[PDB]
Homo-oligomer: A and B are copies of this chain.
């Protein structure tokens, strides 16, 4: 399934998706997106 983990490297509030995604790519995930409410950066990968 699609598994998520908060990014270990992304700092600040998650406004834009692209920075979050880039952080998540750098830590071997497939994507990254901002979370629903708290605007955390979630990295996603098939699991």
Contact = CB atoms under 8 A, between A and B. Distances in A.
A23 to B, nearest CB: 14
B36 A3 contact: no
Given A4-B5, A5-B1, A47-B5, A36 B38 contact: yes
Nearest to A2: B5
Contacts of A5: 1-4, 47
A1 B42 CA distance: 13
A36 B45 CA distance: 21
Given A1-B8, A2-B5, A3-B47, 14 more contacts: A1-B5, A3-B3, A3-B4, A3-B5, A3-B45, A4-B4, A4-B5, A5-B47, A36-B37, A36-B38, A37-B37, A37-B38, A45-B47, A47-B47
